[PDB]
Design a protein around this ligand. Sequence first.
Ligand SMILES: Nc1nc2c(ncn2[C@@H]2O[C@H](COP(=O)(O)OP(=O)(O)O)[C@@H](O)[C@H]2O)c(=O)[nH]1
Length: 360
Amino acid sequence: AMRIGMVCPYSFDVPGGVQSHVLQLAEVLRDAGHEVSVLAPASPHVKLPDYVVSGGKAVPIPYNGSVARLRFGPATHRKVKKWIAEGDFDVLHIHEPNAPSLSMLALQAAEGPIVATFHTSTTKSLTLSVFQGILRPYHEKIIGRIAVSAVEIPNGVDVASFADAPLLDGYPREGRTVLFLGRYDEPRKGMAVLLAALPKLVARFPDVEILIVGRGDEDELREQAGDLAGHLRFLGQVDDATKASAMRSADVYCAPHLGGESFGIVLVEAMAAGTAVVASDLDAFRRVLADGDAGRLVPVDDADGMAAALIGILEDDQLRAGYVARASERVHRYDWSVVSAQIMRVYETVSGAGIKVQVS
Ligand SMILES: Nc1nc2c(ncn2[C@@H]2O[C@H](COP(=O)(O)OP(=O)(O)O)[C@@H](O)[C@H]2O)c(=O)[nH]1
């Protein structure tokens, strides 16, 4: 039984891959009998387990010449030190130690058995001394290093949570349903590509629904869709259980991203749910879908290609069933059962009898 301290650099107020990774990992560890405490920025808009501690709020920097938009004040520095001093941790696991970040503040404040996970291409570069710049002395305090895609370990999901989620009332729809999940106002999420494919999709599937999960300006999007707006259904930013149900209820999950640096955990969620994936040919997505074995890859920012792919998947039951089968086999390697074991081996490696994380 270990005492583990974890640091998330991002508020839980907004959904994100790093945020969900840290909370779920904490839950998995506690279920195995370990003690976990999570430090993260102020998250007053969501309900959180009692083991989450607020590191305070990053406030805007009020002057020109900064190298960041937001900064944690002196209260945060004090909170971080107190949290470490009182935590008596066997391991400190920090996520995304970008500078400046709450994770880097924790790294500066602490020493002892420290592990870091690098979630993106940008933070993976920090495994190299040349990219650590004048923060080298702090990066040198990291004892174990995990790259999501040092040791490589993929981010985890609870497969059963998706596989066995209840269907939403009224689903599956005879008219078919394409699911989009994300903050659709952000251009990088590629809602614009799916909207440009919509006329061809509706011509072939006259009763099709685009089911949309995530926060954004629904009225602007409807206006963009013009006289096809009636094919759009918005759930808003729903809880995790509803999201899982939505995934299972859709006939296809569409991931039309124009770019990004993440692992692509939403594709894994769809695979777990038993829902066929059509995705942009991004490196991260190609890996999850085993180079097209476990889902359909479409060239990036290609609306005609995206329509063909979505129409193709909905029209060919054999093909769709094949992707789902290969995906359901594949996705077990991302389950927390398997993934958390790999992470614990790193914890074991960096820790040792009578050694604790302490304040620097
Ligand atoms: N419950 C819920 N989860 C969401 C919502 N939007 C995103 N997520 C989850 O947040 C994570 C997003 O991962 P990712 O695609 O990498 O988002 P990113 O971090 O912004 O790149 C996944 O677990 C999503 O299922 C939402 O509206 N509701």
